[PDB]
Design a protein around this motif. Structure first.
Motif, PDB file in Angstrom:
ATOM      1  N   UNK A   1      48.560  26.359  60.177  1.00 55.56           N
ATOM      2  CA  UNK A   1      49.077  26.225  59.053  1.00 55.56           C
ATOM      3  C   UNK A   1      49.570  27.605  58.462  1.00 55.56           C
ATOM      4  N   UNK A   2      49.918  28.655  59.476  1.00 55.40           N
ATOM      5  CA  UNK A   2      50.315  30.065  59.021  1.00 55.40           C
ATOM      6  C   UNK A   2      51.514  30.475  60.422  1.00 55.40           C
ATOM      7  N   UNK A   3      52.479  30.751  59.419  1.00 55.25           N
ATOM      8  CA  UNK A   3      53.559  31.632  60.544  1.00 55.25           C
ATOM      9  C   UNK A   3      54.041  32.880  59.898  1.00 55.25           C
ATOM     10  N   UNK A   4      54.209  33.788  60.843  1.00 52.96           N
ATOM     11  CA  UNK A   4      54.995  35.111  60.520  1.00 52.96           C
ATOM     12  C   UNK A   4      56.462  34.841  60.611  1.00 52.96           C
ATOM     13  N   UNK A   5      57.281  35.360  59.237  1.00 45.98           N
ATOM     14  CA  UNK A   5      58.567  35.633  59.404  1.00 45.98           C
ATOM     15  C   UNK A   5      58.928  36.811  59.738  1.00 45.98           C
ATOM     16  N   UNK A   6      59.939  37.222  60.639  1.00 42.36           N
ATOM     17  CA  UNK A   6      60.383  38.503  60.756  1.00 42.36           C
ATOM     18  C   UNK A   6      61.929  38.547  60.526  1.00 42.36           C
ATOM     19  N   UNK A   7      62.492  39.625  59.818  1.00 43.00           N
ATOM     20  CA  UNK A   7      63.761  39.844  59.712  1.00 43.00           C
ATOM     21  C   UNK A   7      64.202  41.323  59.978  1.00 43.00           C
ATOM     22  N   UNK A   8      65.589  41.618  60.073  1.00 39.44           N
ATOM     23  CA  UNK A   8      65.897  42.790  60.564  1.00 39.44           C
ATOM     24  C   UNK A   8      66.989  43.373  59.842  1.00 39.44           C
ATOM     25  N   UNK A   9      66.734  44.783  59.308  1.00 36.93           N
ATOM     26  CA  UNK A   9      67.976  45.585  58.641  1.00 36.93           C
ATOM     27  C   UNK A   9      68.268  46.416  59.644  1.00 36.93           C
ATOM     28  N   UNK A  10      69.840  46.285  59.987  1.00 35.89           N
ATOM     29  CA  UNK A  10      70.390  46.896  60.914  1.00 35.89           C
ATOM     30  C   UNK A  10      70.771  48.181  60.380  1.00 35.89           C
ATOM     31  N   UNK A  11      70.181  49.626  60.538  1.00 38.42           N
ATOM     32  CA  UNK A  11      70.627  50.678  60.138  1.00 38.42           C
ATOM     33  C   UNK A  11      71.713  51.269  60.917  1.00 38.42           C
ATOM     34  N   UNK A  12      72.937  51.760  60.272  1.00 41.61           N
ATOM     35  CA  UNK A  12      73.939  52.443  61.032  1.00 41.61           C
ATOM     36  C   UNK A  12      73.279  53.729  61.937  1.00 41.61           C
ATOM     37  N   UNK A  13      73.582  53.749  63.130  1.00 41.57           N
ATOM     38  CA  UNK A  13      73.041  55.006  64.115  1.00 41.57           C
ATOM     39  C   UNK A  13      71.713  55.119  64.502  1.00 41.57           C
ATOM     40  N   UNK A  14      70.818  54.041  63.926  1.00 43.30           N
ATOM     41  CA  UNK A  14      69.565  53.990  64.148  1.00 43.30           C
ATOM     42  C   UNK A  14      69.126  52.765  64.922  1.00 43.30           C
ATOM     43  N   UNK A  15      69.766  51.366  64.628  1.00 48.36           N
ATOM     44  CA  UNK A  15      69.258  50.325  65.133  1.00 48.36           C
ATOM     45  C   UNK A  15      68.610  49.448  63.913  1.00 48.36           C
ATOM     46  N   UNK A  16      67.787  48.445  64.424  1.00 46.68           N
ATOM     47  CA  UNK A  16      66.967  47.501  63.522  1.00 46.68           C
ATOM     48  C   UNK A  16      65.637  47.848  63.260  1.00 46.68           C
ATOM     49  N   UNK A  17      65.242  47.648  61.978  1.00 42.82           N
ATOM     50  CA  UNK A  17      64.069  47.625  61.660  1.00 42.82           C
ATOM     51  C   UNK A  17      63.587  46.314  61.245  1.00 42.82           C
ATOM     52  N   UNK A  18      62.599  45.880  61.726  1.00 39.75           N
ATOM     53  CA  UNK A  18      61.734  44.609  61.758  1.00 39.75           C
ATOM     54  C   UNK A  18      60.815  44.724  60.530  1.00 39.75           C
ATOM     55  N   UNK A  19      60.938  43.521  59.599  1.00 41.78           N
ATOM     56  CA  UNK A  19      59.748  43.595  58.434  1.00 41.78           C
ATOM     57  C   UNK A  19      59.335  42.130  58.658  1.00 41.78           C
ATOM     58  N   UNK A  20      58.062  41.855  58.395  1.00 42.31           N
ATOM     59  CA  UNK A  20      56.952  40.713  58.523  1.00 42.31           C
ATOM     60  C   UNK A  20      56.832  40.209  57.290  1.00 42.31           C
ATOM     61  N   UNK A  21      56.642  38.828  56.822  1.00 33.99           N
ATOM     62  CA  UNK A  21      55.987  38.348  56.090  1.00 33.99           C
ATOM     63  C   UNK A  21      55.357  36.959  56.508  1.00 33.99           C
ATOM     64  N   UNK A  22      55.037  36.247  55.548  1.00 38.02           N
ATOM     65  CA  UNK A  22      54.031  34.763  55.896  1.00 38.02           C
ATOM     66  C   UNK A  22      54.551  33.687  55.211  1.00 38.02           C
ATOM     67  N   UNK A  23      54.360  32.661  55.976  1.00 35.87           N
ATOM     68  CA  UNK A  23      54.680  31.156  55.659  1.00 35.87           C
ATOM     69  C   UNK A  23      53.426  30.389  55.805  1.00 35.87           C
ATOM     70  N   UNK A  24      53.045  29.791  54.663  1.00 35.54           N
ATOM     71  CA  UNK A  24      51.471  28.849  54.792  1.00 35.54           C
ATOM     72  C   UNK A  24      51.749  27.716  54.098  1.00 35.54           C
ATOM     73  N   UNK A  25      51.360  26.914  55.121  1.00 38.19           N
ATOM     74  CA  UNK A  25      51.374  25.229  54.573  1.00 38.19           C
ATOM     75  C   UNK A  25      50.115  25.136  53.867  1.00 38.19           C
ATOM     76  N   UNK A  26      50.363  24.369  52.657  1.00 35.88           N
ATOM     77  CA  UNK A  26      49.135  24.010  52.041  1.00 35.88           C
ATOM     78  C   UNK A  26      49.402  22.437  51.676  1.00 35.88           C
ATOM     79  N   UNK A  27      48.700  21.545  52.340  1.00 34.98           N
ATOM     80  CA  UNK A  27      49.178  20.199  52.436  1.00 34.98           C
ATOM     81  C   UNK A  27      50.516  19.912  52.322  1.00 34.98           C
ATOM     82  N   UNK A  28      51.064  19.256  51.149  1.00 33.86           N
ATOM     83  CA  UNK A  28      52.536  18.840  51.000  1.00 33.86           C
ATOM     84  C   UNK A  28      53.466  19.920  50.723  1.00 33.86           C
ATOM     85  N   UNK A  29      53.108  21.277  50.663  1.00 33.71           N
ATOM     86  CA  UNK A  29      53.992  22.019  50.037  1.00 33.71           C
ATOM     87  C   UNK A  29      53.755  23.588  50.933  1.00 33.71           C
TER      88      UNK A  29
END
Ligand SMILES: CC1(C)S[C@H]([C@H](NC(=O)[C@H](N)c2ccccc2)C(=O)O)N[C@H]1C(=O)O
Ligand SMILES: [O-]
Ligand SMILES: [Zn+2]
Ligand SMILES: [Zn+2]
Length: 241
Positions: A28-56
């Motif tokens: 019931x738990x997933x990690x989301x990861x998204x990436x900020x592209x910094x010019x001249x440096x590359x991508x910076x990953x950031x993580x959060x969570x997704x949680x299923x709780x029954x029907x929501x």
């Protein structure tokens, strides 16, 4: 594939979806990861969570941007196909709150530390629609966090920022430290520009003590780690005092 300059790389168990990566941590738990592209440096990953709780579904942290956050909602729609009840965001910086407008457009109720909401305009962020407040020992005041299901919100004290909050997932062995916690092999505590260098070590240890049986520690810029992430973060923070 996406190979960020900062953040964990893709490994077995990762799903690429649009510009994002998703990893199942528990049934019931997933990690989301998204990436900020910094010019001249590359991508910076950031993580959060997704949680299923029954029907929501419950979300912890936005992606860096509104478009990336909309992609999170699209992944949820495709893979889970249940509505998002609420999101909690863990402080007023772009990696955690940059996508508020996408949540609001989708009709999702948003929650943050009252202090994060107060700082948001100063930080170029949009405040959450609801404010969480905390007891003297860090636990969220329950009346401010209605219908949070398994999300157990804890304010550990000032560290990475004065407003940083953390979230345990009740009924699992997972706790989320956001940007407060760095991994067990980290060489730095990241951006200390808004940090409380006096109190950081105690705050990191307070997070550990709030969720003493969490064995999987999730954080913003590395893969999920053991409790050594907490102890190593605190040891690095001891050197700031
Ligand atoms: C990854 C970080 C070094 S940057 C991120 C955050 N910074 C931002 O969200 C900034 N908007 C940003 C500016 C330029 C390049 C990347 C991020 C912060 O200051 O805590 N969290 C930091 C951290 O968790 O230590
Ligand atoms: O951050
Ligand atoms: Zn931050
Ligand atoms: Zn961060």
């Amino acid at each position: 594939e996406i190979r960020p300059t900062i953040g964990q790389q893709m490994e077995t168990g990762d799903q690429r979806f649009g510009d994002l990566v998703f990893r199942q941590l528990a049934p019931n738990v997933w990690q989301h990861t998204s990436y900020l592209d910094m010019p001249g440096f590359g991508a910076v990953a950031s993580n959060g969570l997704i949680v299923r709780d029954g029907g929501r579904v419950l979300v912890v942290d936005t992606a860096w941007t509104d478009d990336q956050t909309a992609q999170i909602l699209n992944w949820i729609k495709q893979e889970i196909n249940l509505p998002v009840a609420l999101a909690v965001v863990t402080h007023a910086h772009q990696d955690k709150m940059g996508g508020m407008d996408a949540l609001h457009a989708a009709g999702i109720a948003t929650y943050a530390n009252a202090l994060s909401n107060q700082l948001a305009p100063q930080e170029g962020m949009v405040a959450a629609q609801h404010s969480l407040t905390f007891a003297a020992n860090g636990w969220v005041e329950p009346a401010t966090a209605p219908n949070f299901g398994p999300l157990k919100v804890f304010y550990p004290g000032p560290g990475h920022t004065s407003d940083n909050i953390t979230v345990g997932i009740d009924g699992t062995d997972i706790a989320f430290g956001g940007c407060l916690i760095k991994d067990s092999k980290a060489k730095s505590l990241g951006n200390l520009g808004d940090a409380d260098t006096e109190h950081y070590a105690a705050s990191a240890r307070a997070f550990g003590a709030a969720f003493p049986k969490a064995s999987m520690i999730v954080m913003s810029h590395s893969a999920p780690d053991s409790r050594a992430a907490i102890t190593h973060t605190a040891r690095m923070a001891d050197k700031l005092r």
